[PDB]
Amino acid sequence: CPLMVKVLDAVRGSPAINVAVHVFRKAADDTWEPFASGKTSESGELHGLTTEEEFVEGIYKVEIDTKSYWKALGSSPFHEHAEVVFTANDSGPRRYTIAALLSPYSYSTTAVVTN
Amino acid sequence: CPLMVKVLDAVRGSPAINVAVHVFRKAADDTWEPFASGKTSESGELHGLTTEEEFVEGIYKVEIDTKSYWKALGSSPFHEHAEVVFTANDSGPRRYTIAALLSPYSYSTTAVVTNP
Amino acid sequence: CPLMVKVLDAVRGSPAINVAVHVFRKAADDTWEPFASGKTSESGELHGLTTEEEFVEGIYKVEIDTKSYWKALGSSPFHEHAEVVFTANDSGPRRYTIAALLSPYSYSTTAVVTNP
Amino acid sequence: CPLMVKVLDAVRGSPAINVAVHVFRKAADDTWEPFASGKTSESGELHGLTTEEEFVEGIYKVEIDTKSYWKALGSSPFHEHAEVVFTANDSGPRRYTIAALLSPYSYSTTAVVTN
Numbered sequence: 001c002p003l004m005v006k007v008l009d010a011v012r013g014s015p016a017i018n019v020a021v022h023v024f025r026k027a028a029d030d031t032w033e034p035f036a037s038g039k040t041s042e043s044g045e046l047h048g049l050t051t052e053e054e055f056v057e058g059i060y061k062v063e064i065d066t067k068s069y070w071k072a073l074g075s076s077p078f079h080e081h082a083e084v085v086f087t088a089n090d091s092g093p094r095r096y097t098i099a100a101l102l103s104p105y106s107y108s109t110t111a112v113v114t115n
Numbered sequence: 116c117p118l119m120v121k122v123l124d125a126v127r128g129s130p131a132i133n134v135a136v137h138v139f140r141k142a143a144d145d146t147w148e149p150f151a152s153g154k155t156s157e158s159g160e161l162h163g164l165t166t167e168e169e170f171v172e173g174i175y176k177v178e179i180d181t182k183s184y185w186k187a188l189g190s191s192p193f194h195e196h197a198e199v200v201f202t203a204n205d206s207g208p209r210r211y212t213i214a215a216l217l218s219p220y221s222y223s224t225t226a227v228v229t230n231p
Numbered sequence: 232c233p234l235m236v237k238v239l240d241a242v243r244g245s246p247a248i249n250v251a252v253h254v255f256r257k258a259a260d261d262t263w264e265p266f267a268s269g270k271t272s273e274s275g276e277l278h279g280l281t282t283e284e285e286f287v288e289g290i291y292k293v294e295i296d297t298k299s300y301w302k303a304l305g306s307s308p309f310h311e312h313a314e315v316v317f318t319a320n321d322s323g324p325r326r327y328t329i330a331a332l333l334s335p336y337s338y339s340t341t342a343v344v345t346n347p
Numbered sequence: 348c349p350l351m352v353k354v355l356d357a358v359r360g361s362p363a364i365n366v367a368v369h370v371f372r373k374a375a376d377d378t379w380e381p382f383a384s385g386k387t388s389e390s391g392e393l394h395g396l397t398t399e400e401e402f403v404e405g406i407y408k409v410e411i412d413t414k415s416y417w418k419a420l421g422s423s424p425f426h427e428h429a430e431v432v433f434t435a436n437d438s439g440p441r442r443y444t445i446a447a448l449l450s451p452y453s454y455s456t457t458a459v460v461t462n
């Protein structure tokens with residue numbers, strides 16, 4: 001599990017459950033190729049997106065469908081989605097956690113990169 | 116104006132207006148002595164808390180009354196307040212902006228510290 | 232000035248100066264068309280990106296070039312940029328401030344949306 | 348485990364390891380009584396602070412010694428510590444996670460409250 005996504009809800013103080021997450025890899029021609037996707041669990045986590053063999057160095061985009069999340073809760077949001085764009089580097093540690101903390105007009109995101 | 120406080124609401128995407136703020140300074144006996152207080156304006160800003168003369172070196176606590184803010188809007192929040200505790204003016208006078216971004220179960224705070 | 236961008240540095244406690252910002256607007260064919268660009272000033276603010284006339288309804292992407300910022304300061308950061316994607320002016324003209332707070336492996340962004 | 352503390356480092360993109368954390372309970376006379384304390388683990392977590400029987404309703408303060416953390420890494424910080432002050436309410440869900448994301452001149456904190 002080299003890539004994990006964790007999503008929290010700052011309005012309810014809870015994991016953000018059943019949020020759609022799409023990961024893309026940047027192709028040679030600067031387009032975004034679908035790579036992996038899923039929905040966050042009851043604990044706000046999405047595991048099993050990729051494998052060590054598939055997750056090569058490159059630029060990746062993690063798109064979190066925040067707009068749909070907020071609308072399903074009956075709350076009016078600002079963003080279309082949250083985007084996290086980063087380079088995977090084999091020099092760095094091997095496990096990437098992308099965390100995001102959501103509010104209707106704001107979000108925070110951090111990377112936890114460990115061995 | 117060497118100490119300013121700015122507060123935003125992350126639910127509304129607006130300034131957080133009418134937020135009460137209490138500033139304390141640690142006394143010689145290591146208790147928290149009341150130093151200044153005020154409330155944020157329509158722009159979410161609180162100016163005029165103190166003066167260059169009065170804002171001496173010390174350890175200061177800026178308490179932002181987030182629970183009262185949210186309750187006044189009919190919301191039950193998690194935190195009692197947001198506390199920002201820092202040493203000021205240890206290398207000479209500086210200007211401090213304490214910014215805070217509020218959600219019902221979360222907040223962020225940052226400091227912008229300028230000149231010398 | 233209907234679109235403004237403000238960027239802070241959470242490591243230094245200062246405005247993030249000379250941050251490049253590129254704004255795109257989604258075209259009829261659903262590609263991202265370049266709309267405006269600029270860089271933050273000494274105050275960490277970017278004004279004058281667009282005009283009320285030009286800033287029509289649409290889906291906009293504000294790309295803040297955080298990697299170039301950090302690399303220019305001799306730091307290797309995590310993200311390529313911070314992207315802020317939103318629908319604008321769907322209920323008539325509004326003024327948008329996009330704020331971002333930067334750390335080498337993290338950022339926060341919020342929107343302040345005002346009048347009608 | 349009704350109370351857990353998790354601390355992350357936004358400069359290095361890592362858990363915040365060996366951070367001192369002190370929890371206090373507000374007494375009848377408005378003073379802060381020591382309640383529990385510890386140091387975060389290699390995963391930036393502090394488990395086992397209290398038990399269900401001990402963690403009664405009331406106002407609690409979680410003090411995270413951010414200044415010492417940053418100084419041990421050779422980095423100059425702004426805050427003396429980070430403080431998180433909240434009421435424990437038996438009406439709400441039963442497990443509290445206090446999370447904090449640290450930078451030298453900023454921090455974020457959120458509560459994840461679940462059953």
Ligand SMILES: N[C@H](Cc1cc(I)c(Oc2cc(I)c(O)c(I)c2)c(I)c1)C(=O)O
Pocket residue numbers: 121123212214215216217223224225227237238239274276328330331332339341343
């Ligand atoms: N100093 C002003 C501009 C300015 C606007 C805002 I609005 C602000 O407030 C926040 C609050 C949070 I919370 C953030 O995450 C961020 I980014 C900015 C700050 I500080 C400065 C000038 O004179 O130009």
Ligand SMILES: Oc1ccc(/C=C/c2cc(O)cc(O)c2)cc1
Pocket residue numbers: 006008099100101108109110337353355444446447448455456457
């Ligand atoms: O298991 C976990 C529990 C909580 C967290 C919190 C992450 C987090 C991310 C942010 O961008 C801001 C913040 O205040 C917190 C991460 C992992």
